[PDB]
Amino acid sequence: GPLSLSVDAFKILEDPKWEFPRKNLVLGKTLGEGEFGKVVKATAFHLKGRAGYTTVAVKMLKENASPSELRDLLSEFNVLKQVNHPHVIKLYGACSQDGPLLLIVEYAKYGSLRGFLRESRKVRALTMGDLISFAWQISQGMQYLAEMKLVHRDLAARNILVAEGRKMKISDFGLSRDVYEEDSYVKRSQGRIPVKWMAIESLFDHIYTTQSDVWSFGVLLWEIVTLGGNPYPGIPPERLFNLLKTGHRMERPDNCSEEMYRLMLQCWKQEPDKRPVFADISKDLEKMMVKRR
Amino acid sequence: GPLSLSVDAFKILEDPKWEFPRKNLVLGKTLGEGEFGKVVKATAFHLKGRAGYTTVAVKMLKENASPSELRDLLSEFNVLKQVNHPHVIKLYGACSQDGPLLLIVEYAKYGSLRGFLRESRKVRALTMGDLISFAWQISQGMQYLAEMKLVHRDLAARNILVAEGRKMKISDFGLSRDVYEEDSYVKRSQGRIPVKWMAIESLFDHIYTTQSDVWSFGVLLWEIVTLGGNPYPGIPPERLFNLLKTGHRMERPDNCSEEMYRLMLQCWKQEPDKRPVFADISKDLEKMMVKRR
Ligand SMILES: Nc1ncnc2c1ncn2[C@@H]1O[C@H](CO)[C@@H](O)[C@H]1O
Ligand SMILES: Nc1ncnc2c1ncn2[C@@H]1O[C@H](CO)[C@@H](O)[C@H]1O
């Protein structure tokens, strides 16, 4: 089927640009379980011309992996090899021969944005300026992907990494799709994306575009302002069908300006063409930044 | 889409036979995460005519549930309401109004078969007679499902429960499908079943029938004889495409008779029509049982 064709090609085709000697990689502790497997911390000897050891993260499958998870790991490789942006996590290499498939990616010293924020306090002291900075960085990375006609489909604070210098890195591309041809991606079966982050047309009609990524960015903006809060708090996920279709949205959270909340609401308009594009969002966030000084 | 139609019907249609008052249910500790959500231990007051409290298990979604997981919870309800067999876990009720969707099911005091076996020793002392008994009980439950034209699709020791009296209960029906019409179920997208338990035609061609459940039962038979061992040990899941197609199978494990291993191999024939049916499997297991006395 499609996956056996992909697996075989991946193993057969050995892009020297990407293949890395397993004997030069040492795996350490588990950093998490992501969308399709586990991520561990690792170190890589003489990676990409760099002398000595480089600390990296490695994405791999678990023993009980399903075909869906394997597909997602290959999808993530296929996308990450094509993109390069200061706010998108970097692919360094892969191991595809003589052992389990491993992706070698940039290590983000602070982990996920949601973890980073939940460990902080609003005044780790983070100001509203810091939060707006985080959001803007993410919007920049998404402008780039959107220009590349890539839809991420799972934008959420758990899928943003926080690197050296508190720099945002969009990550977890296993579910991301190319929409160059048709400007949308449609999935006939049910999504494997949490209900509370999907745009209304994704949830009901299974349609994904850069405008549904904008809806998810609105939910991410709410996670940022609440320092890692849980969206639609106390609302069971299955109630989101009725809640969204009858025009309800999350309320303005505590320490959130009127301007920032209006931006979330515009991201959550029912009609996708009425939502901002990422270029608009970055502009809104820049303006809030300079107004605050 | 299909899921919003299902959700709405489930909430709207209130089969009095199944609906249970939330105020009569008390939830306790988490027993696990299953295929689509979490299972907790609970107690239910005046359940199904029974005086007083009854200990039960409750299946529910997590806050981050995807549409796939919600679909699977509804699928499980739809199937469990139709089946009744001493080796299939029982549905007692559901809560579908004024709060999160909850399925109320029979509590199995010993948990999963895989956990039960890994806590045991071969001589908890379990004899080969006990192990064969477990396998037979499971085969009986699968004969019944197969006669009902239901394919389970995720038969594995983690999805068998061990009740009072060490009685097997097949469980986790979220992925199970009706094949009354066509005698197969085909899934166009990738499966969410661990690669190491799927039949070769399920893995490559996405075809599921009662004969692919027979293949998975062979892997379950291997888990039983190894007291909870991990299938294809040390073999990455993505290598199973090449391994199975070139005709390789698991080796005979340590404390396993020649007859029992031949039964596993017959379950794993490449051609589904050459595998035994569950009625044959039960007969093989009964004969091994009486031969041992
Ligand atoms: N590249 C990475 N660098 C650091 N931690 C990571 C990386 N990718 C994933 N993680 C961690 O693994 C978890 C699962 O995605 C994340 O929440 C984060 O904690
Ligand atoms: N009906 C049940 N009774 C008892 N434990 C259960 C039940 N369903 C699931 N579990 C537990 O939850 C885990 C997840 O399925 C199982 O491994 C088992 O430990």
Side-chain angles (χ1 to χ4, degrees), chain A residues 1-11 14-89 91-97 99-120 122 124-180 183-238 240-250 252-257 260-261 263-265 267-273 275-282 284-286 288-290, chain B residues 1-11 14-89 91-97 99-120 122 124-180 183-238 240-250 252-257 260-261 263-265 267-273 275-282 284-286 288-290:
Chain A
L3 181 60
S4 64
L5 294 173
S6 291
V7 164
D8 184 48
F10 189 77
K11 290 177 161 305
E14 192 171 331
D15 194 328
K17 172 160 65 163
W18 298 110
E19 186 77 14
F20 185 78
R22 218 169 281 275
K23 72 180 190 71
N24 280 7
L25 182 74
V26 180
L27 302 184
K29 72 182 184 187
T30 296
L31 295 168
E33 263 86 343
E35 188 271 330
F36 60 76
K38 64 178 150 187
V39 179
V40 297
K41 192 174 177 168
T43 185
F45 189 76
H46 198 213
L47 181 69
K48 297 299 232 164
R50 196 267 172 127
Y53 287 95
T54 299
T55 299
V56 296
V58 169
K59 311 270 218 102
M60 59 202 290
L61 295 182
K62 299 165 75 170
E63 292 275 47
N64 68 330
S66 61
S68 63
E69 180 78 13
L70 177 56
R71 176 175 188 227
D72 288 355
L73 179 154
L74 291 171
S75 291
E76 175 156 50
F77 174 82
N78 191 58
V79 166
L80 286 186
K81 68 189 196 147
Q82 302 185 72
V83 301
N84 182 2
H85 190 279
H87 295 298
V88 173
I89 201 72
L91 174 75
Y92 293 141
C95 296
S96 73
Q97 324 271 295
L101 309 184
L102 299 179
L103 304 186
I104 304 167
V105 293
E106 172 183 11
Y107 171 67
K109 111 180 226 197
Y110 295 104
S112 75
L113 181 59
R114 177 177 168 275
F116 181 79
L117 301 168
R118 291 175 67 89
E119 283 180 336
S120 305
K122 183 66 165 329
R124 177 177 306 98
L126 297 175
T127 68
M128 183 55 70
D130 294 326
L131 302 183
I132 286 167
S133 166
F134 296 163
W136 175 87
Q137 288 176 47
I138 294 156
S139 188
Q140 293 286 285
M142 290 304 307
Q143 281 191 232
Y144 167 81
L145 298 171
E147 289 176 357
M148 298 284 286
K149 306 289 189 45
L150 280 165
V151 175
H152 186 284
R153 297 180 62 234
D154 195 8
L155 183 64
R158 60 178 174 274
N159 291 334
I160 301 305
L161 297 171
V162 181
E164 273 255 39
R166 271 134 61 152
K167 299 296 182 203
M168 309 292 99
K169 306 281 177 176
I170 295 159
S171 73
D172 292 69
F173 285 86
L175 293 182
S176 70
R177 298 286 185 277
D178 164 62
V179 296
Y180 176 79
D183 277 328
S184 69
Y185 169 75
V186 169
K187 184 167 178 54
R188 183 186 289 260
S189 55
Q190 295 303 327
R192 304 183 274 101
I193 301 142
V195 165
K196 287 186 175 186
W197 280 257
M198 300 198 306
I200 194 185
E201 68 277 9
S202 310
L203 178 65
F204 277 89
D205 298 347
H206 298 217
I207 289 167
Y208 300 82
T209 65
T210 289
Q211 299 312 98
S212 51
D213 277 346
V214 163
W215 177 292
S216 300
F217 181 89
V219 180
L220 169 54
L221 250 194
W222 187 97
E223 296 183 274
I224 291 172
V225 171
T226 61
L227 297 185
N230 296 314
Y232 308 92
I235 298 186
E238 67 278 13
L240 262 289
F241 291 100
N242 186 70
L243 180 161
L244 294 179
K245 87 179 168 191
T246 57
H248 291 85
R249 297 300 186 265
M250 283 189 274
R252 186 172 156 217
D254 274 7
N255 302 286
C256 176
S257 63
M260 180 67 80
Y261 182 58
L263 180 49
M264 305 177 187
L265 294 171
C267 291
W268 304 327
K269 300 277 170 217
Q270 180 167 267
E271 157 66 40
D273 292 324
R275 299 173 202 152
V277 298
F278 281 107
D280 305 326
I281 289 163
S282 294
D284 294 334
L285 293 170
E286 282 155 16
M288 301 172 189
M289 188 86 103
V290 56
Chain B
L3 181 60
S4 64
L5 294 173
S6 291
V7 164
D8 184 48
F10 189 77
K11 290 177 161 305
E14 192 171 331
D15 194 328
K17 172 160 65 163
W18 298 110
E19 186 77 14
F20 185 78
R22 218 169 281 275
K23 72 180 190 71
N24 280 7
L25 182 74
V26 180
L27 302 184
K29 72 182 184 187
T30 296
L31 295 168
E33 263 86 343
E35 188 271 330
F36 60 76
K38 64 178 150 187
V39 179
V40 297
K41 192 174 177 168
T43 185
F45 189 76
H46 198 213
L47 181 69
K48 297 299 232 164
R50 196 267 172 127
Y53 287 95
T54 299
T55 299
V56 296
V58 169
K59 311 270 218 102
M60 59 202 290
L61 295 182
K62 299 165 75 170
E63 292 275 47
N64 68 330
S66 61
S68 63
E69 180 78 13
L70 177 56
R71 176 175 188 227
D72 288 355
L73 179 154
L74 291 171
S75 291
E76 175 156 50
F77 174 82
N78 191 58
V79 166
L80 286 186
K81 68 189 196 147
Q82 302 185 72
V83 301
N84 182 2
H85 190 279
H87 295 298
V88 173
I89 201 72
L91 174 75
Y92 293 141
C95 296
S96 73
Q97 324 271 295
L101 309 184
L102 299 179
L103 304 186
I104 304 167
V105 293
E106 172 183 11
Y107 171 67
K109 111 180 226 197
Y110 295 104
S112 75
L113 181 59
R114 177 177 168 275
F116 181 79
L117 301 168
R118 291 175 67 89
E119 283 180 336
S120 305
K122 183 66 165 329
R124 177 177 306 98
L126 297 175
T127 68
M128 183 55 70
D130 294 326
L131 302 183
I132 286 167
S133 166
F134 296 163
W136 175 87
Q137 288 176 47
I138 294 156
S139 188
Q140 293 286 285
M142 290 304 307
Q143 281 191 232
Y144 167 81
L145 298 171
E147 289 176 357
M148 298 284 286
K149 306 289 189 45
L150 280 165
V151 175
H152 186 284
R153 297 180 62 234
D154 195 8
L155 183 64
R158 60 178 174 274
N159 291 334
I160 301 305
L161 297 171
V162 181
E164 273 255 39
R166 271 134 61 152
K167 299 296 182 203
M168 309 292 99
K169 306 281 177 176
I170 295 159
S171 73
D172 292 69
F173 285 86
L175 293 182
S176 70
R177 298 286 185 277
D178 164 62
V179 296
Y180 176 79
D183 277 328
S184 69
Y185 169 75
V186 169
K187 184 167 178 54
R188 183 186 289 260
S189 55
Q190 295 303 327
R192 304 183 274 101
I193 301 142
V195 165
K196 287 186 175 186
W197 280 257
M198 300 198 306
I200 194 185
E201 68 277 9
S202 310
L203 178 65
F204 277 89
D205 298 347
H206 298 217
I207 289 167
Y208 300 82
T209 65
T210 289
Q211 299 312 98
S212 51
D213 277 346
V214 163
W215 177 292
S216 300
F217 181 89
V219 180
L220 169 54
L221 250 194
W222 187 97
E223 296 183 274
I224 291 172
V225 171
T226 61
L227 297 185
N230 296 314
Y232 308 92
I235 298 186
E238 67 278 13
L240 262 289
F241 291 100
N242 186 70
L243 180 161
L244 294 179
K245 87 179 168 191
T246 57
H248 291 85
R249 297 300 186 265
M250 283 189 274
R252 186 172 156 217
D254 274 7
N255 302 286
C256 176
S257 63
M260 180 67 80
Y261 182 58
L263 180 49
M264 305 177 187
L265 294 171
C267 291
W268 304 327
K269 300 277 170 217
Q270 180 167 267
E271 157 66 40
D273 292 324
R275 299 173 202 152
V277 298
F278 281 107
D280 305 326
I281 289 163
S282 294
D284 294 334
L285 293 170
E286 282 155 16
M288 301 172 189
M289 188 86 103
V290 56

